Design a binder for these strands. Structure first.
Ligand SMILES: *C[C@@](*)(O)[C@H](CCCNC(N)=[NH2+])NC(=O)[C@@H]1CCCN1C(=O)[C@H](N)Cc1ccccc1
Lengths: 253, 27
DNA sequence: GGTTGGTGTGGTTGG
């Protein structure tokens, strides 16, 4: 995360770090949406234009972290991917439409002080919350500056949902309905954004309905990190729930 | 079931140093 | 990894 802070312990029981076997490195963030299913961005697993094509085999899931670096000896928990499901219309070629992927863990994650799943958006909550100027919370072990350098800790940033249109005159990229942008405006005199490392990251909300937290976005792309005039593109988790709920409810946990 | 309710935050009726930013958004 | 304490939640500067 760019221009943000340390996560306080247990600030995101959901936040999961998915990271490579060999070489033993980090590739992305995930959110644990239940004891067995994990929500990530697909481009973490597949971007044919850079050779990203990881496999249940080559990837590792580790739930309950805090420090980037150290293996959190008795909080942190490491899991075995049973399968990954990229979304049929994933569009890696053009602009990342429904740049999502579930992956079902080998065996169920025990919950804890530290491990807890996030709420998945209901049609309702989606209606009321996803609104411009409204803040949302993004998190992770990503570059601290677009270029250099990395946190030893989970960074958290509070960014405002941006107007549907504004997003658009920001990037020549062809923006869609399975995309929501988020940021502080040039002048809004406040900063932060996700970054190269972040992706699959949950972008959460707290319904002041029940005080539950909700995944709304997912980290997706945008140009650079914290470019004046640029805004991070997340994934309309909602917008894509049905496919989301089709599978869990098909071969899910 | 008991999604997005933290065992050390919501769950012990405490809130984070930034949560508040978030419900002040919704105005 | 690094101040044998703290989510690197014991007691082995590692593992
Ligand atoms: C994997 C990631 O975490 C990352 C998210 C970073 C986005 N930056 C900000 N401020 N939100 N995703 C990516 O970097 C994706 C995957 C491949 C390229 N990419 C990008 O966001 C490019 N920077 C832009 C892009 C190129 C082609 C198609 C879509 C987007």
């Amino acid at each position: 995360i760019v221009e943000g802070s340390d996560a306080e312990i247990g600030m995101s029981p959901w936040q999961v770090m998915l990271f490579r076997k060999s070489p033993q490195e980090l590739l992305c963030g995930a959110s644990l949406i239940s004891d067995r299913w994990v929500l990530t961005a697909a481009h973490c697993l597949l971007y044919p234009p850079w050779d990203k094509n990881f496999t249940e085999n080559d990837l590792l899931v580790r739930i309950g972290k805090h420090s980037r670096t150290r293996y959190e000896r008795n909080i942190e928990k490491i899991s075995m991917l049973e399968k990954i499901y990229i979304h049929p219309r994933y569009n890696w070629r053009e602009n990342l439409d429904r740049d999502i992927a579930l992956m079902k863990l080998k065996k169920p994650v025990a919950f804890s002080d530290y491990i807890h799943p996030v709420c998945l958006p209901d049609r309702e909550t989606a209606a009321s919350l996803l609104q411009a100027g409204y803040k949302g919370r993004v998190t992770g072990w990503g570059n601290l500056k677009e270029t250099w350098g990395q946190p030893s800790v989970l960074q958290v940033v509070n960014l405002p949902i941006v107007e549907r249109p504004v997003c658009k005159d920001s990037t020549r990229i062809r923006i869609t309905d399975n995309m929501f942008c988020a940021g502080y405006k040039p002048d809004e005199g406040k900063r932060g954004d996700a970054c190269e490392g972040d992706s699959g990251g949950p972008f959460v909300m707290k319904s002041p309905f029940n005080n539950r937290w909700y995944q709304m976005g997912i980290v997706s792309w945008g140009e650079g990190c914290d470019r004046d005039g640029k805004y991070g593109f997340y994934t309309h988790v909602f917008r894509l729930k049905k496919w989301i709920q089709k599978v869990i409810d098909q071969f899910g946990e | 079931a008991d999604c997005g309710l933290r065992p050390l935050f919501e769950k012990k009726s405490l809130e984070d140093k930034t949560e508040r930013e978030l419900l002040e958004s919704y105005i």
